[PDB]
Design a protein around this ligand. Sequence first.
Ligand code: CLF
Ligand SMILES: [Mg+2]
Ligand SMILES: [S]
Lengths: 461, 513, 119
Amino acid sequence: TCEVKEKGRVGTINPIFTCQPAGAQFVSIGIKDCIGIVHGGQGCVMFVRLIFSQHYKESFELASSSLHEDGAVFGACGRVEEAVDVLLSRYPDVKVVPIITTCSTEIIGDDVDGVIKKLNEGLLKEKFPDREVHLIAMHTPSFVGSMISGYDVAVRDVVRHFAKREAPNDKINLLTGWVNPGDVKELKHLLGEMDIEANVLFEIESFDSPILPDGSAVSHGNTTIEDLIDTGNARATFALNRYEGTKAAEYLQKKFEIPAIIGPTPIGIRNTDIFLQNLKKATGKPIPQSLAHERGVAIDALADLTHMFLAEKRVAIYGAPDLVIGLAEFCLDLEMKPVLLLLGDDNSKYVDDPRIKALQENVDYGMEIVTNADFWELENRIKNEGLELDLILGHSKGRFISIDYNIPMLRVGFPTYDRAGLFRYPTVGYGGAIWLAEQMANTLFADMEHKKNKEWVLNVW
Amino acid sequence: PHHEFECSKVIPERKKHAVIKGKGETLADALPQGYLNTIPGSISERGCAYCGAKHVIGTPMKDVIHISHGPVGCTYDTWQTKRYISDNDNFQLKYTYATDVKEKHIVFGAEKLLKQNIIEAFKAFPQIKRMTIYQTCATALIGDDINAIAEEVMEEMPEVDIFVCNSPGFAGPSQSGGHHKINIAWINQKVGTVEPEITGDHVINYVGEYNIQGDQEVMVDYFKRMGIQVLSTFTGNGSYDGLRAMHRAHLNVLECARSAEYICNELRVRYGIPRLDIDGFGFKPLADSLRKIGMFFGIEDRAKAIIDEEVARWKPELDWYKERLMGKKVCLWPGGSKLWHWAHVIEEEMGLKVVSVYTKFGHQGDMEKGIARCGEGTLAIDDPNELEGLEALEMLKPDIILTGKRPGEVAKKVRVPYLNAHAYHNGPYKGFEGWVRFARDIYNAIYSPIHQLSGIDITKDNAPEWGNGFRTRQMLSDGNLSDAVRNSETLRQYTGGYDSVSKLREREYPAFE
Amino acid sequence: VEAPVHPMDARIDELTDYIMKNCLWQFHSRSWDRERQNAEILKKTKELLCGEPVDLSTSHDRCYWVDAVCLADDYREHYPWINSMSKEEIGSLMQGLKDRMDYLTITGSLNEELSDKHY
Ligand code: CLF
Ligand SMILES: [Mg+2]
Ligand SMILES: [S]
């Protein structure tokens, strides 16, 4: 049966995620003309910019308040004030400036809402009166939740800041979740075929930036102030990822009565079907033949693989909880046996997830879902408790388990730095169902050749 | 004279932190400021004091549980971003630990949490009996006494030893404060606590080497061929108990002065051990370094032999690249020591023109070394920020920069190639072979046909034909070489394999008695 | 502090350049260390350049000596004019050098950290 249990150890060995501020920084890099300031020590931002570099091989703009010894003793609201001044004074185009707290500035208790109000009435009116500048508090203490909850918080804070319901319209708010450019592309394709306009939070396709002959391009997000304000006017909010867009979706529900459709994460055929059904329901638009065709093209790809190769494969999955769960679900439709799911933070709401209730009702073999997990929860099981696996699905930080215990691994989630180009491919939708199934197969195939495990069978499947 | 960036006029203090080496100017005439606080909002390249302590110096130790007392973030953000390898199966890259400080610890403290963590860690890794606890922002602020907890555990558990590093992010302007803190904490807590078996008449500490892509293994190979016992390395490929015996060295060979001069300075004071500064990079600096180390022990013959065979083996290949690299402009933009290790020898030996150097966290001593070795005209920058970096690229138009990963990707967008000065490309870059590897990577970056393609505007109505589906590096590089060069019988491209270090781990070293 | 002067400033321009471009022993961490280093190594360089014996009776001496030997040798090779100069002129050249080196690295130094009493 499928047993949900909390990690036993109190400590962390080999972490799956980083802290809430990293999630707020990720939200912020997805907004046009946005540069967050991370209020804390320099590493809290510089290390996170490296994370994003590791995934994308691009540099994104984020600043530090540069906390030092004095501010840690006496308070550091002045460090923020100077930061805002220095940032605005040197970056003329910036219009959005999140103020993102860290463990330090939360503990020492700096009044961020206070110092923002001061700058709005003060500095911004005096020195910068001709400029649009939105300062936004993001309270993201590192000693609760994770980058995942930080993301949820930040999306709420940006929508809370900007959303107004002046001119109701028929658009939806699509909160993609923390996904790849290839996911944004896929989701936009689905919306286009449904003929449904949306505010897409976030438009990060432009993270894949060119080298132009005139050296003029840069990676940036394209979610605009206008789009964020327009979130108040939508007829519904589709928050695909419950752990990354519940707060913003419910905020708009509670504040403007915009209905929130939370999940399921559209991973796999069946979950993509539910998305399209939910769009129809919300908007009244019919599901067109063209998507039934693309769906069937996807199913064809899956048919070639499922009972021949994927059936009964033993899978471990980790990463963002919505990804983990979505993948587990799709794997079961692919006849596979996900046997260990790691959910690598303290969220108390996993046990209440309907998708996890369904797994508990319906799974009929030995499965574990470990909450507050770390990578030692997987490695210890392999090394000392005889867990047998055919495949891992997760991000690159788990890689040494794959490498050193000879279990092949498909790179999914964030960050994926030990493979090239993965951000351009979908994991959601019908296109993503194709990509996941074919790449799991291709991963298994390479492994069968490595180990000489019936490698000769790959001829007339 | 001092230099002021257009981008930094609105922050006039920045003028004090950069100088162009003027005609006839000596070190007494101008020197950048250094080791001052950071300007908030500037998008400085700098990191935190926990970075300098834990991430740079502490973690290289290969037989140690590196546990960060704090929330998960600090630990995750320092994991799998470094290439300090080891001959203990890269234990220090594969396993990392955080205590996972939570809300309820903010009021009450997290000393119980810490101790439980320590026991869990030793239990999970029964082959590891050494630990270093690193303080972070959060645990500094809540005031846990890490030192007391570590002593409580060592009393309970005599088979283990625990080093304590109290260097949180905010403790200082940059990496630099953490270098100091861990240097001093190590010598205060740990040096003198172990008596080492000596296995030779010639004994060194190799100090300030972090073994990026095998640099330490390159150097220690030379030393083992000289019949020198390397008592310890601080800290690349280093053993915890090896470092506890640093007091017994006959000499401190110091490569990275920035990070490790502190501990050498105190070893001279406390135990009378002399300090010899060396260079790890380049044929001359390295030969001089090896000559001096051998001559100090009366075994200069052995060092001369090594120098002779290595230069013969590799100089024909270095010179291949030099000939194609002549006059190419380079910015030396690491964090610290590398900038001055490289500044002269790279001009002399690879033919590059150094047009700029920069230090993220360096002191005025590093700018001294930097400016001393650079040519007139060179822009030196202290605590550079992103806009200044970009303006320097526009102003100097370098052919390549040696810099960090993400700064490399900034340069990428404006058509300037990079090598990773920090983590290397096809490293390691120390040693004779390493210097050729280095030169080759520079060649391959500069003369990339993809780089040449990126400069072409395909929309341009004027653009000429191509009528050819490729252009090789050597097509783009060899067009204007002397017939003598181009047709040489000695000059050749790098002949070494992908991994230049694995062979050394097998190598056998004859005792000289 | 004023830059020192010397009859043989031309030739000290050359020898100073070399040390700035090649040597590290002149850039230790604190003024008192720099005084010691400048004095001890330029001492043994003169001694060696002047056929005079050198004292190798502590490990510190050997450490100064090794930098001294290399510096002497490069002077004889790369600056071979020095080789046709009497012990009188050489001792004069070395005193001029030490003074410039002490100026550039100690008394004229813009490195503010050289007086920190703590390492
Ligand atoms: S300056 Fe450096 S990296 Fe920053 S916190 Fe401080 S020691 Fe650490 Fe840590 S858990 Fe996350 S990443 Fe920060 S907000 Fe706190
Ligand atoms: Mg790219
Ligand atoms: S730094």
